[PDB]
């Protein structure tokens, strides 16, 4: 089972996010989304319109989302990848290079048309 | 196959919507969503942030939604129900009584809170 993962806040979803998620899920057989908690969301210098729970509920309702886990901080990726047996790590193009350090643990992929 | 249908604009799509949709789909085996076209939105003194296509794509991505069709006007429901062999018609509480005329063609249900 090729397991894919992606991180993000996913606050006011606009079809743009759905496209990213679908493409991500498309690269495996199972997609995990590490949803930024409201505390970390704050750390990221944001104050989401929708709270974690609500954002989680919406993501879970999306056909392409198989599991939503909480992203509580910057240094949990490496651990997540191992803990959840992640095969592919996907992020938007605007993160290109930012997570290459995971390349030795899994397939790192930066999408294209991800404004 | 118990086919359910519901109408609406579903613009800035979030969980409140999801709640209604899931509940709706829950009453049958297949859920149809008649998405208000952008033209029909103006007719309802409403202007969406997301255009019909984008709203449609988002709905389609929701596990509870099996089909999205365009709602072009106020008087297509009776027709839709027949044309799509709709068994149950669902709408939010705020529409209670407003579509009872369909009761003779299908099960009309107004969700609570």
Give a concise summary.
Two copies of one chain form a homodimer. The first copy, chain A, has 115 residues and is of the alpha/beta class. Chain A contains four helices and five strands, in the order E-H-E-H-H-E-H-E-E.
CATH superfamily descriptor of chain A: HUPs
Largest interface, and how many residues on either side?
A: A-B, 15 and 15 residues
Q: Which geometry of chain A do the CA atoms define? A: globular
Strand element count of chain A: 5
CATH topology of chain A: Rossmann fold
Number of DSSP helices of chain A?
A: 4
Q: Which band does the percent of strand residues of chain A land in? A: 15-25%
Strand order of the largest sheet of chain A: 3-2-1-4-5
Oligomer: homodimer
CATH architecture assignment of chain A: 3-Layer(aba) Sandwich
Order of helices and strands of chain A: EHEHHEHEE
PDB class: transferase
Keywords: cytidylyltransferase, Rossmann fold, transferase
Assembly: dimeric
Entry title: Crystal Structure of CTP:Glycerol-3-Phosphate Cytidylyltransferase from Staphylococcus aureus
Write structural notes for this entry.
Two copies of one chain form a homodimer. By secondary structure, chain A is α/β, with parallel strands linked by helices. In chain A, about 30% of the residues lie in helices and about 25% in strands. Chain A is built from four helices and five strands, in the order βαβααβαββ. In chain A, α1 links the parallel β1 and β2. Chain B: This is Glycerol-3-phosphate cytidylyltransferase. Chain B: InterPro entries: Archaeal_FAD_synthase, Cyt_trans-like, G3P_cytidylTrfase, Rossmann-like_a/b/a_fold. Chain B: GO terms for molecular function: glycerol-3-phosphate cytidylyltransferase activity; metal ion binding.
